[PDB]
């Protein structure tokens, strides 16, 4: 029914620790696999940490908060999600100071919040800048996601696809350098071909099918008209349908239906465009006038899709077709191609101009390959987005967590009070990241982790991480595990904030 | 057909069971014999109540499932065409002949031989 | 430590469950390996009995109760789709890899190190297979040895020689001048009321529905083939009209008017016959797929035509390529250019039905393999043995290299791995040692099914050594080491190559499963 | 939960482990099947009390009837049963042979497998010795049929086949079946068991039975027509009554005046229907249903013979003979669906009117054996003895070779195979010697059914066959264990009867040994 | 799992013959005391409730209708005794 007292905070630990203990071995390139039993007897062997916790039914409420926060992390960054839950579970894994020591939660919460500002300032000291003009340096960065995949052969092509696409969407004049993949970077798939044939289309491609055989197949200078309203007989303010039981009245309603549709379509063809793009649907009587003009009929195009077309060919959005002016034209468009590609109808408005957006064309032999190439380029574009926002890299392979753990230990000597004990626990909680990398490789954990702490004490903390494949110690200047700083900052801010949120709840009450 | 759950009574115990069923009717009417005989209470299926000591009327109102007990009732239809008074005396006499016949069956005398003696 | 209505195994016991699943499946399918092996019975529950030694059938069709063993059943499905053989030896190797690795895992060795040993041993065994294969040209004498080796396992060693000449001759005719070969060029048919030894070749195609009329010719020496999709039965009005009748008799009068469109088309068939080769010692055949009116059957029967109707789609497809007749959807376009050519056409009468033989053709690019058997399940067992024999010969002609059989290659690879020092990790040799002893399960199982000792048979074949190349194998009858190349025992190269790739990937993923969790179950 | 079930990975199908020996419990299923039909072998075989699925009480010693009534649900046991169905093909005898002999191979195979011999060596041992049996069997042929088509010779051969089925009637049924068989024999290759049809009639006893030509039906002629040569015959399964159309045809009967109108209408409907039969020229009409009283008047009006057959199988016999199909409607005038017959007349044999359909102009194999009996249970078993007798001579239409009966060939063939198994070295000698001892099951089962000690009979047979005296079988007597010459007694079996029986029974036992496990599957 | 009979009741050998002998004595027991002119009578009631009283052996056997298969054999012999002779059914059964 409900829980109260120390059992809530002690229960929230076991709930968050149990969820974390599953994916502990899912981190790293050597990460172990898992087995899920379907209710019908099926088996899913996927090692992806996002798919595992998605199919697991969790009873405890705090266990749901661990999953919902990880799902939000996937939207912003498609990497490092597993590291968030491991750190969020390890920081809460030490219950000694929580209960046995009889310390008040706010005393411990103040320790994490002070340790959070120190973990952020340490990463900026050990970071390194990046030259975004050279595409060779961006190649080894993206290869982190490309490795152990089937696109490794086309990896050289996969880099140019994600790099040039994000650079177009990035608008640096505003000062915030905002990049939106879910709109301007929108991707569609093309059946047929091979992986090499995949290129980056400059423009906005529409998947609308060809309804009638009369359309413009190829145009040197396309003309595009953008208007929101649908082409139909004008109705009343309500949705009430028109019911006519008399034949004489049918001729009165049909004449009004043919007159208004022909009137709006007459003002559209006055400019003589090559296509008509409407936001809503298009009736059958309206398509009869569109096929007579020998122009392409396009409908069901959202607002964001229309905003990109207006900046591409120079179009203009008008509320009603009767108000269309000469300002709406498609002048400047490269070509218009309705030609069938891969047994599917495509539309190319592509041009020589950069309307803060583009379209990615995915070629492939089968739909199984298309699904593999798609998801592999998605996170690769997010890697390009995270680097262009903060062009700074931090050493990976566990070198970043150990470099911060050494700074927290040295600073705790000057801290005087009861908060020094939980403040040092954060330094030992960051060692779980290099620990799982060694355990998955098979090498001894205690022997290597002890010698690793001696390297950051003497040598520079920017190097000497942990090799995941081999298992020994290697510098990060000689290896490509360098990771973007924007990912590590979001990881530590989320791991600490989630651990604080669960400690603040001392009672679970059921009611509405 | 319908051989299962078929009631069967055979052997020497069958004769002693038939006599016991016959003595139940004779012991009932022997109290009503004579002018001073006690009456009997009759409750009809419809709720009517009547009181009579007449033996022929009692046998008509008695509902008995046992087969030998039904034979005792069929005798009343034959005697009422002649006497109609001492009909009870015949049922009592029939019960006395069977009651004394029970002592003879223990000696090993065949039933047909007993019926020849009467 | 788990959520309600579920179960999880945190410790290594989750790995022990998967190992016990492979060992249980290994003991079931080890008895059917080799010709001396036994047979498994398939009961569908409806009273149907099926008997086959094929590993792909005993897995794909039979549903396994244990969840983990069902994954291996799906692997043999993709295994048979590529090579077509080796599904039985695939499971036996996977079971031994997990068994030999269990000895080292129980000592505290991490599974990842063992999996790295399999990858290093797979490349060494794959490069050693390069020197074993023989580049000799494929001829009739070699294809017989490949056919006998593949058939002897799926039959009683009786129909082998009967089915040997049927499989070899069917492949040689459909491939000339290094042309890509397709098994869809060969048709499989089944007849009843005949002994199982009556299986023979069919040069043409076997047709289901024959001709019905007393005057139909039982055999026609020469004739032309006219392909038609048109139905000659009763049809509605072709032009624009309707049903106008004052009685039941007037409606039947419009029937003759609607039939006039078809009856005039029936005369066009008779006209074309007399125009092109309408003299003596000639004939004509109607392969028309749709039905034909009985009255139209009488008009065509008097001219010597053998009518056909109610055919299938696959029949008309092969009759188009074999005979050469062009599909004609309307008889107004009827022309002699669409006529084909065929040899002797006769209908062999069975004890029940009658089938049509189009045989004696020049280059039909199609043949048929006719199977005869006393029962239904016997026909199914032979049909599986034929397709398994066709892919064995197809892979032998496509890839000009063949490898010795009878466990000669598996023993030869095990020796090179032991003498091979680790090229990657010092502790990776334990995985190589486990993979080396796993390749020895093939000659061991052949010794059990033959009724001999497992140890004595393996020691003799391993004791064979010389300066030059020496490859020996397990002899089932004698038991002594026997050279598989001399006695005509050969296997396909793509089969042995695919086992090394398949047994390595599947046995690796099983060792990589850390925990078993229940989702929604 | 650990420990798990042994060897069962599939659909809960019971899988016998190594110590469980799945092979033996499959032999045990086929062993119990042989014990049921082992006591029915021979002339002294015990009768079996069988309850039909219709809850009818049947008593018969026939083995083929038992397997139809007793449902065999064991898969490995069906292989021997399916071998018995193939045994009825190419020969009409040897059913009890396969059930007893196939079980004898499996009983002795259990003794070899306990020694540790492989199952593959036991399979190869039978197939080698089986080929030796087919070579020796021709040398055991003593006498052959003279091919004289004489009733004395034809009835003398039926004494063995009728024996073990109907006892005490061996003398009578020998001449009765002979008269029907000698009629077809002049036709080369035309002899067929379906051409001789048996029709049973309730009567005094078997001694009142006779033999007639053509198709003899127990149902008399409803019409007064005696004999007609009309070849047109129309079989109608619909009973004769008021003609009703497949449409609505609602008849509203209100007052007695209209009641007589529609009553006379049915007489007019039956008038036009029978008139359409005489218009087509068909004077013979077969009725599957009942016959109206007024229809008998129009039958004699147009001089059309009427036949009423209540049995459904009697109608199918005419459909496959003269070719007259039974139409669902009431007397459709269709000439194409009629039959052809040369002679049609009514006859009386045994104080019973019988209808005869034969061909006077065309020769024909058509013949009918009329049977009489008091009890339908005993009379039906006589029909089973006739089919086994007729099928015996269907084999003699091929090459005629006869072998001694009464277990005479079984001892002679087991003695010769034992010699080859002793000279042959290796491990195949074990399965060969057990293959020879499997022949001993027949004379043991034949002696036990006669109330004679089995070991005493087997000992005497080896003594007389060792000295070189052939043709010595088992004498049938209750108190006499001794033996007599079969050739002088007239007991002879069929060469092809034993040839095909040994081959089919061999492959039946081999296939069972090849299957070591039974697994259920799902579609 | 796989059973030959699957609920089929069958038995052979000596016990099957002994069981039939005990069943035949039950049929003869009912008509046993009815032999002779002076023999005792029997009382049989049907489903209607009426009682049939007589010493006739042919009438009693018709009303019993025993479901035992071997018992039906002796009943059928009594029916053949009526057509050939018409009496003695009690003597033949006993």
Rg (alpha carbons) of chain B, rounded to whole number? 17
| Spatial separation of the C-alpha atoms in residues E43 and E53, rounded to whole Å | 5
Strand order in the sheet with A359-362: A187-189, A359-362, A200-201
Q: With contact defined as beta carbons under 8 Å apart, do D31 and D103 qualify?
A: yes
Maximum Cα–Cα distance across chain B: 52
Tell me the C-alpha distance between D98 and D119, whole Å: 22
Tell me the CA distances in angstroms from D60 to B62, D57, D378, one per residue in order. 57, 10, 8
Residue with tokens 């095990």: C414
Give the residue from C263, C272, C290, C265 showing the smallest Cα distance to C223: C272
Are D516 and C28 in contact (CB < 8 Å)?
Answer: no
**CA nearest neighbour of D515 among C52, C382, C60:** C52
Query: Which of D219, D198, D207 shows the shortest CA–CA distance to D353?
Result: D219
Cα(A167)–Cα(A160) distance, integer angstroms: 11
* Interior/surface letters A19-34, b for 16+ CB within 10 angstroms, e for the rest: bbbbbbbbbbebbbbb
Cross-sheet strand order for the sheet of D196-202: D196-202, D367-373, D210-213
Cis peptide before D76, with omega less than 30 degrees from 0?
Answer: no
Ranges assigned E (strand) in C302-460: 305-306, 345-349, 354-357, 367-372, 402-404
φ, ψ of residue A25 in degrees (nearest 5): -90, 5
Burial of C206: CB neighbours in 10 Å, binned 0-12, 13-18, 19+: buried
> Measured on CA atoms in the order B51, B57, B61, B65, is the torsion positive or negative?
positive
Q: Residue C266 in contact with residue C296, Cβ under 8 Å?
A: yes
What is the per-residue burial (b if ≥16 Cβ within 10 Å, else e) of C75-97?
A: bbeebbeebbbbbbbbbbbbbbb
- Contact, D373 vs D238, CB < 8 A? no
For CA atoms C412, C416, C418, C423, the dihedral sign is negative
A81 is catalytic: yes
Two structure tokens written together for D359: 């061909």
How far apart, in whole angstroms, are the C-alpha atoms of residue C379 and residue D102? 24
Rounded Cα gap, residues D218 and A289, in angstroms = 87
Return the ∠ at Cα B74 (arms to B72 and B77), rounded to 5°.
125
CB A463 within 8 A of CB A476: yes
Cα–Cα distance measured from residue C71 to residue C512, given in angstroms and rounded to the nearest whole number: 14
> Cα angle vertex D501, ends D496, D506, to 5°?
135
Kindly report the backbone phi and psi dihedral angles of residue C301, in degrees, each rounded to the nearest multiple of 5, phi listed first: -70, -30
Say which residue the tokens 């010493």 belong to.
E55
What whole-number distance in Å separates Cα of residue A317 and Cα of residue A229?
A: 10
Q: Which two tokens stand for residue C341?
A: 């050519």
Neighbours of D27 (CB within 10 A): 23
Sign of the CA dihedral running A192, A195, A201, A204: positive
E strand or H helix at A376: helix A367-389
Query: Is the dihedral angle over the CA atoms C132, C136, C137, C139 positive or is it negative?
Result: negative
Tell me the pairing of strands D367-373 and D210-213. Answer: antiparallel
Asked whether the beta carbons of residue E43 and residue B112 sit closer than 8 angstroms, the reply is no
β-pairing verdict for A3-4 and A507-508: antiparallel
Let me know: does C243 contact C254? Beta carbons within 8 Å: yes
Question: Do the beta carbons of residue A432 and residue A398 sit within 8 Å?
Answer: no
Q: How far is CA C251 from CA C248, C255, C398, D246, D247, in A?
A: 5, 7, 65, 20, 19
Q: Say which residue the tokens 């009786």 belong to.
A: C158
The answer to whether D47 touches D38, Cβ cutoff 8 Å, is no
Interface of A with C in 426-485 (CB under 8 A): 440-442
What is the CA C7 to chain-centroid distance, rounded? 42
D461: which 2 tokens? 């047979």
Residue indicated by tokens 């340790």? A115
> What string of DSSP letters covers A434-448?
HHHHHHHHTS-HHHH
Active site residue A327: no
A36/C67 CB distance under 8 A: no
Q: Could you tell me the two tokens for D66?
A: 């038992």
If interface means Cβ-Cβ distance under 8 Å, which residues of chain D face chain C? 4, 7-13, 15, 75, 78, 82, 86, 117-121, 511, 514-523
CA distance A404 to A119: 6
Residue C350 near residue C341, CB atoms below 8 Å: no
First to last CA, chain E: 47
Distances (CA, A) of D351 to A208, A369, C126, D347, D356: 94, 91, 94, 10, 15
Distance (Å, rounded) from C-alpha D216 to C-alpha A79? Answer: 95
Using a threshold of 3 CB pairs under 8 A, tell whether chains E and A touch.
no
Helix axes D22-38, D95-115, angle to 10 degrees: 150
| Calpha distance C53→C385 (Å, rounded) | 10
Contacts of B67 in chain E (CB under 8 A): 43, 45, 51
Q: Is B84 labeled as ligand-binding?
A: no
Alpha-carbon distance of D331 to D270, in angstroms, equals 9
Resolution stated for this PDB structure, in Å: 3.8
Contact indicator for A88, A498 with CB cutoff of 8 Å: yes
What b-and-e string marks burial along C318-355, b requiring 16 or more CB atoms within 10 Å of the CB? bbbebbbbeebeebeebeeebbbebbbbbbeeeeeebb
Evaluate the omega torsion of the peptide bond into residue D3 and state whether it is cis, within 30 degrees of 0.
yes
- Residue of D36, D70, D74 lying closest to E2 (CB–CB): D74
* Lookup: tokens for C248: 């039941």
C518 in A contact zone (CB under 8 Å): yes
- Are C63 and C185 spatial neighbours (Cβ–Cβ below 8 Å)? no
Instruction: Using an 8 Å CB-CB cutoff, list chain C residues near A59.
Output: 3-4
Q: What would the two tokens of residue D185 be?
A: 């024999």
CA distances from residue C56 to C94, C465, D471 in whole angstroms, order as listed: 15, 36, 55
Helix (H, G, I), strand (E, B) or coil at C349: strand
Q: D201 Cβ partners below 8 Å, 6+ apart?
A: D218, D350, D352, D370, D371, D372
A221 contact partners, CB below 8 Å, separation of at least 6: A330, A331, A332, A333
How far, in Å, CA of C386 to CA of C390, rounded?
Answer: 6
List D215's β-bridge partners, or say none.
Answer: D357
Alpha-carbon span C190 to C198, nearest angstrom: 11
Nearest to D413 by CA among D141, D177, D97: D141
Pairing of strands D515-520, E42-45: unpaired
- What sign has the CA pseudo-torsion A395, A401, A406, A411? positive
Say if the Cβ atoms of C65 and D119 lie within 8 Å.
no
Active-site residue set of C: 54, 87-88, 388
Contacts of D511 in chain C (CB under 8 A): 51
Using CB atoms within 10 Å of the CB of residue D237, give its burial: 0 to 12 exposed, 13 to 18 middle, 19+ buried: middle
Across the B/E interface, how many CB contacts are shorter than 8 Å? 12
Which residues have CB under 8 Å from C320's CB, separation 6+? C227, C326, C327
Residue found under tokens 């004696």: C360
Q: How far is CA A93 from CA A13, A115, A425, C414, D5, in A?
A: 7, 17, 10, 49, 42
Backbone φ and ψ for C195, nearest 5 degrees, come out as -70, 160
A450: annotated active-site residue: no
- Give me the residue from D13, D49, D70 closest to E1, CB to CB: D13
CA distance E9 to chain D (A): 11
Helices and strands (H and E) in chain A: how many: 16, 18
**Per-residue exposure over C442-478, b if at least 16 CB sit within 10 Å of its own CB, e if not:** bbbbbbbbbbbeeeebbeebeeeeeeeeebbbbbbee
Which residues, listed in sequence order, are joined to residue C190 by a DSSP beta bridge? Answer: C371
Q: How was this structure determined?
A: cryo-EM
Q: Going by DSSP bridges, is the β-strand pair A483-484/D196-202 parallel, antiparallel, or unpaired?
A: unpaired
Tell whether A359 is in a known binding site. no
Angle of helix D151-162 relative to helix D170-184, nearest 10 degrees, comes to 130
Q: Rounded distance, CA C30 to CA D39, Å?
A: 42
As to burial, measured by CB atoms within 10 angstroms (0-12 exposed, 13-18 middle, 19+ buried), residue D382 is: buried
Facing B112 at nearest CB: one of E38, E47, E67: E38
Q: Is D341 helix (H, G, I), strand (E, B) or coil?
A: coil
Residue E73, phi then psi, degrees to nearest 5: -65, -50
Residue C200 backbone phi and psi in degrees, to 5: -145, 180
| CA-based R_g, chain C, Å | 31
Cα distance between residue A36 and residue A54, in whole Å:
11
CA distance linking residue C134 with residue C126, whole number of Å: 15
**Eight-state DSSP code of residue A96:** I
Q: List strand residue ranges (DSSP E) for D162-312, in order.
A: 196-202, 210-213, 215-217, 227-228, 233-236, 284-287, 305-308
The shortest CB-CB distance from C516 to any of A21, A37, A56 is to: A37
Of D4, D9, D11, the CB nearest to C25: D9
Q: Closest Cα to residue A9, out of A87, A85, A94?
A: A94
Q: Which of A379, A436, A491, A498 is catalytic?
A: A379
Both tokens assigned to C257: 């008017």
Q: Do A38 and C521 touch (CB under 8 A)?
A: yes
> Which chains reach chain A with 3 or more Cβ–Cβ distances below 8 angstroms?
C
Contacting residues of C for D117, CB less than 8 Å apart: 451
C-alpha to C-alpha distance for A188 and A344, rounded to whole angstroms: 12
The C-alpha atoms of residue A74 and residue A374 are separated, in whole angstroms, by 16
**D464-484 burial, b for 16+ CB within 10 Å, e for fewer?**
ebeeeebbbbbbbeeeebebb
Which residues are B50's β-sheet partners?
B42
CB A214 within 8 A of CB A291: yes
Are the Cβ atoms of A35 and C14 closer than 8 angstroms?
A: yes
CB contact under 8 A, A44 and C519: yes
Contact B67 E45 (CB under 8 A): yes
- Main-chain dihedrals φ then ψ at residue A78, nearest 5 degrees: -90, 20
CA nearest C53 in D: which residue? D515
Is E6 at the interface with chain D, CB within 8 A? yes
- In sign, the C-alpha dihedral spanning D501, D507, D513, D516 is negative
Query: Is position E87 annotated in a ligand binding site?
Result: yes
């Amino acid at each position: 029914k409900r829980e109260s007292g120390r059992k809530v905070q002690s229960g929230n630990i076991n709930a968050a620790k149990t969820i974390a203990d599953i994916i502990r071995t899912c981190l790293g390139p050597k990460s172990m696999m898992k087995m899920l039993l379907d209710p019908m007897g099926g088996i899913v062997m996927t090692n992806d940490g996002n798919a595992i916790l998605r199919e697991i039914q969790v009873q405890h409420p705090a266990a749901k908060s661990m999953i919902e926060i990880s799902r939000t992390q996937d939207e912003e960054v498609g990497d490092g999600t597993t590291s968030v839950i491991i750190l969020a579970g390890e920081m809460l894994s030490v219950a000694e100071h929580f209960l046995e020591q009889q310390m008040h939660p706010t005393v411990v919460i103040s320790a994490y919040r002070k340790a959070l500002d120190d973990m952020i300032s340490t990463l900026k000291k050990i970071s390194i800048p990046v030259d975004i003009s050279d595409s060779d340096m961006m190649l080894n960065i993206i290869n982190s996601s490309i490795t152990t995949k089937a696109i490794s052969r086309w990896s050289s092509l996969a880099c140019n696809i994600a790099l040039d696409a994000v650079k177009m969407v990035q608008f640096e004049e505003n000062g915030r350098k905002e990049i939106d993949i879910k709109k301007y970077a929108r991707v569609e798939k093309i059946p047929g071909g091979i992986i090499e044939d995949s290129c980056v289309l400059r423009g906005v491609m529409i998947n609308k099918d060809v309804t009638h055989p009369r359309m413009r197949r190829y145009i040197k200078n396309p003309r595009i008209v953008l208007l929101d309203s649908s082409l139909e007989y004008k109705k009343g303010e309500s949705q009430t349908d028109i019911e006519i039981t008399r034949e004489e009245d049918f001729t009165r309603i049909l004449q009004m239906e043919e007159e208004y549709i022909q009137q709006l379509c007459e003002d559209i063809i006055q400019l003589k465009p090559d296509v008509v793009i409407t936001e809503k649907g298009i009736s059958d009587l309206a398509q009869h006038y569109l096929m007579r003009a020998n122009i392409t009929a396009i409908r069901r195009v959202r607002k964001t899709d229309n905003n990109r077309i207006a900046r591409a060919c120079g179009a203009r959005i008008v509320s009603r077709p009767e108000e269309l002016r000469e300002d709406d034209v498609g002048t400047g468009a490269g070509l218009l191609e309705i030609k069938k590609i891969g047994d599917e109808y495509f539309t190319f408005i592509t041009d020589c101009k950069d309307p803060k957006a583009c379209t990615i064309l995915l070629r492939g032999a089968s739909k199984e390959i298309l699904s593999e190439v798609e998801r592999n380029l998605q996170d690769a574009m997010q890697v390009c987005r995270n680097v262009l926002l903060d062009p700074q890299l931090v050493p990976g392979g566990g070198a970043s967590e150990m470099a911060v753990a050494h700074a927290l230990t040295e600073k705790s000597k000057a801290m005087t009070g009861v908060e020094q004990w939980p403040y040092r626990a954060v330094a030992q909680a960051l060692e779980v990241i290099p620990r799982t990398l060694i355990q998955n490789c098979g090498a001894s954990t205690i022997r290597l982790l002890t010698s690793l702490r001696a390297k950051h004490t003497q040598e520079n903390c920017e190097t000497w991480g942990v090799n995941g494949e081999t298992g020994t110690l290697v510098d990060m200047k000689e290896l490509g595990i360098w990771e973007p700083l924007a990912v590590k900052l979001q990881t530590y801010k989320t791991a600490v904030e989630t651990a604080v949120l669960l400690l603040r709840i001392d009672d679970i009450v059921s009611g509405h | 057909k319908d051989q299962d759950r078929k009631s069967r009574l055979m052997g020497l115990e069958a004769l002693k069971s038939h006599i016991m069923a016959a003595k139940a009717v004779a012991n009932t009417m022997r109290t009503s014999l004579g002018p001073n005989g006690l009456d009997k209470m009759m409750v009809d299926k419809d709720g009517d109540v009547t009181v009579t000591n007449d033996g022929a009327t009692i046998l008509s109102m008695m509902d008995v499932d046992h087969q030998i007990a039904k034979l005792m009732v069929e005798l009343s239809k034959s005697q009422d065409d002649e006497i109609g008074d001492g009909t009870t005396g015949v049922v009592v006499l029939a019960g006395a002949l069977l009651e004394e016949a029970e002592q003879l069956l223990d000696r090993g005398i065949h039933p047909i031989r007993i019926a020849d003696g009467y | 430590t788990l959520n309600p209505k579920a179960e999880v195994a945190r410790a290594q016991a989750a790995l022990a469950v998967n190992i016990s699943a492979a060992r249980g499946l290994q003991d079931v399918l080890r008895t059917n390996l080799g010709p001396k092996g036994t047979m498994k019975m398939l009961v569908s529950g409806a009273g149907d009995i099926k008997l086959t030694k094929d590993g792909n059938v005993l897995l794909h069709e039979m549903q396994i109760q244990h969840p983990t063993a069902s994954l291996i059943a799906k692997v043999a499905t993709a295994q048979d789709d590529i090579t077509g053989d080796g599904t039985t030896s695939n499971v036996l190797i996977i079971g031994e890899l997990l068994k030999q690795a269990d000895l080292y895992i129980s000592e505290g060795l991490h599974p990842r190190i063992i999996t790295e040993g399999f990858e290093a041993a797979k490349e060494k065994a794959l490069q050693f297979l390069e020197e074993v294969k023989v580049s000799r040209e494929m001829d009739r004498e070699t294809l017989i040895d490949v056919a006998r080796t593949s058939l002897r396992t799926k039959v009683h060693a009786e129909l082998a020689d009967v089915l040997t000449e049927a499989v070899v001759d069917s492949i040689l005719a459909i491939k000339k001048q290094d042309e890509p070969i397709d098994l869809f060029m060969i048709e499989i048919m089944e007849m009843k009321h005949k002994s199982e030894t009556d299986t023979s070749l069919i040069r043409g195609l076997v047709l289901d529905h024959g001709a019905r009329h007393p005057d139909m010719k039982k055999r026609v020496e020469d004739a032309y083939i006219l392909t038609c999709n048109v139905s000659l039965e009763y049809e509605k009005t072709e032009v624009n009209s309707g049903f106008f009748y004052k009685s039941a008799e007037e409606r039947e009068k419009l029937v003759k008017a609607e039939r006039k469109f078809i009856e005039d088309r029936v005369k066009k068939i008779i006209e074309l016959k007399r125009k092109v080769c309408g003299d003596s010692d000639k004939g004509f055949v109607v392969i028309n797929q749709k039905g034909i009116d009985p009255f139209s059957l009488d008009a065509l029967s008097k001219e010597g035509i053998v009518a056909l109707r109610r055919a299938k789609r696959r029949n008309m497809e092969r009759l188009t390529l074999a005979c050469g007749g062009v599909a004609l959807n309307s008889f107004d376009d009827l022309s002699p250019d669409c006529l084909g050519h065929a040899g002797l056409v006769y209908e062999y009468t069975l004890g029940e039905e009658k089938f049509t033989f189009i045989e004696k053709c020049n280059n039909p690019r199609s043949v048929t393999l006719l199977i005869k058997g006393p029962n239904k399940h016997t026909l199914t067992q032979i049909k599986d043995a034929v397709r398994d024999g066709l892919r064995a010969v197809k892979n032998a002609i496509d890839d000009g290299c063949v490898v010795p059989g009878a466990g000669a290659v598996e023993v030869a690879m095990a020796e090179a791995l032991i003498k091979h020092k680790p090229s990657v990790k010092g502790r990776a040799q334990l995985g190589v040692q486990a993979f080396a002893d796993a390749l020895l399960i093939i000659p061991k199982v052949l010794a059990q099914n033959s009724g001999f000792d497992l140890q004595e048979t393996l020691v003799k074949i391993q004791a064979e050594h010389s300066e030059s190349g020496q490859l020996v194998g397990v002899d089932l009858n004698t038991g002594e080491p026997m050279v598989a190349a001399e006695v005509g025992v050969w296997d396909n190269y793509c089969v042995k190559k695919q086992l090394l790739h398949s047994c390595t990937v599947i046995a690796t993923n099983i060792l990589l499963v850390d925990e078993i969790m229940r989702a929604g179950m | 939960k650990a420990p798990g079930f042994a060897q069962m990975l599939k659909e809960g199908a019971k899988h016998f482990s190594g110590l469980e020996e799945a092979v033996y419990r499959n032999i045990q299923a086929c062993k119990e099947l042989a014990q049921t039909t082992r006591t029915a072998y021979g002339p002294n075989g015990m009768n079996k009390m069988v309850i039909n699925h219709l809850e009818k009480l049947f008593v018969t010693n026939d083995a083929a009837t038992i397997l139809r009534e007793l449902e065999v649900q064991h898969p490995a046991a069906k292989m021997i049963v399916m071998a018995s169905h193939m045994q009825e093909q190419e020969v009409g005898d040897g059913t009890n042979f396969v059930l007893v002999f196939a079980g004898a191979l499996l009983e002795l195979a259990e003794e070899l497998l306990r020694i540790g011999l492989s199952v593959s060596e036991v399979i190869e041992g039978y197939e080698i010795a089986c080929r030796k049996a087919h070579e020796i069997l021709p040398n055991l042929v003593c006498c052959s049929a003279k091919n004289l088509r004489d009733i004395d010779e034809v009835s003398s051969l039926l004494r063995t086949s009728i024996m073990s089925k109907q006892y005490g009637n061996e003398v009578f049924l020998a001449k009765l079946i002979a008269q029907a068989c000698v009629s077809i024999f002049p036709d080369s290759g035309h002899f067929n068991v379906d051409n001789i049809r048996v029709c049973k009639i309730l009567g005094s006893g078997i001694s009142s039975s006779s033999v007639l030509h053509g198709m003899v039906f127990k149902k008399e002629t409803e019409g007064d027509v005696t004999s007609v040569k009309d070849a047109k015959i129309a079989v109608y399964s619909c009973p004769f009554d008021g003609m009703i159309t497949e449409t609505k045809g609602t008849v509203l009967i209100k007052t007695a005046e209209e009641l007589m109108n529609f009553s006379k209408g049915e007489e007019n409907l039956m008038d036009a229907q029978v008139k359409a039969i005489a218009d087509t020229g068909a004077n013979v009409v077969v009725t599957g249903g009942k016959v109206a009283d007024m229809a008998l008047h129009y039958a004699n009006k147009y001089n059309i013979m009427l036949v009423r057959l209540n049995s459904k199988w009697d109608l199918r016999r005419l459909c496959k003979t003269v070719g007259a199909t039974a139409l669902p409607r009431l007397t459709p005038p269709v000439l194409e669906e009629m039959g052809h017959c040369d002679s049609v007349y009514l006859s009386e044999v045994g104080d019973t009117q019988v209808v005869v359909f034969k061909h006077e102009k065309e020769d024909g194999a058509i013949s009918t054996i009329v049977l009489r009996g008091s009890t339908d249970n005993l009379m039906d078993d006589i029909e089973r003895a006739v089919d086994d007798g007729v099928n015996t001579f269907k084999v003699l239409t091929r090459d005629k070779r006869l072998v001694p009966g009464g277990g005479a060939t079984e001892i002679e063939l087991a003695k010769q195979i034992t010699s080859y198994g002793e000279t042959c070295p290796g491990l195949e000698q074990y399965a060969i010697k057990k293959f020879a001892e499997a022949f001993e099951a027949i004379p043991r089962a034949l002696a036990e059914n006669s109330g004679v000690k089995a070991n005493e009979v087997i000992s005497k047979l080896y003594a007389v066959h060792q000295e070189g005296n052939k043709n010595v079988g088992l004498d049938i007597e209750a108190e006499v264990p001794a033996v007599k010459d079969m050739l002088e007694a007239g007991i002879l079996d069929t060469y092809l009867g034993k040839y095909w029986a040994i081959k089919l029974a061999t492959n039946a036992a081999v296939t069972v040994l090849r299957v070591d496990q039974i697994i259920m599957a799902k579609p | 799992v796989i059973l030959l009979k699957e609920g089929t009741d069958s038995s052979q050998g000596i016990p099957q013959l002994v069981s039939n002998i005990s069943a035949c004595q039950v049929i003869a027991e009912a008509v046993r005391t009815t032999l002779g002119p002076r023999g005792m009578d029997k009382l049989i009631v049907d489903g209607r409730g009426k009682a049939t009283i007589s010493n006739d052996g042919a009438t009693i056997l018709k009303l019993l209708d025993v479901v035992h298969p071997a018992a039906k054999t002796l009943v059928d012999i009594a029916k053949s005794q009526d057509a050939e002779v018409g009496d003695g059914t009690t003597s033949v059964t006993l």
